[PDB]
Amino acid sequence: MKLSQDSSQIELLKELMDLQKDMVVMLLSMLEGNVVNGTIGKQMVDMLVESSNNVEMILKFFDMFLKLKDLTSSDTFKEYDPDGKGVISKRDFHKAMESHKHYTQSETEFLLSCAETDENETLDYEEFVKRFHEPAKDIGFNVA
DSSP: OOHHHHHHHHHHHHHHHHHHHHHHHHHHHHHOOOOTTHHHHHHHHHHHTTTTTHHHHHHHHHHHHHHHHHHHHHHHHHHHHHHHTOEEEEHHHHHHHHHHOOOHHHHHHHHHHSSSTTSSSEEHHHHHHHHHHHHHHHHHHHHH
16 A cells, blocks of 8 residues: 555565565465365464454455456546557546546545656556556465
């Protein structure tokens, strides 16, 4: 949550997401060879219960940035940005999210905060989604 808003910590957030993916891979290796009602599984479930709130925040993060790409690929967003260059104004981006109505007001504000600011307020949703959705996709798959 902290590093996504600032645009000067993109590399640090990428490194942190890589570390998170490696940790989840380690956990999957721990579950490798699992049996029904296993001790390792029970301990991992206890660990999750201990980290319930953090898992909640991570899952909300992932769900938000997974819905991002579907919202972008919706043809209404193509209406707001008829040209294929990939630059859309911040006003049009907020309108696109409001009309797509997949998101809540808090989520809309959070994507606005994470959105890279432009002198023309015309962000590149292409780099936005390639920066956020893809790590969301590949860590979220292992989490699932």
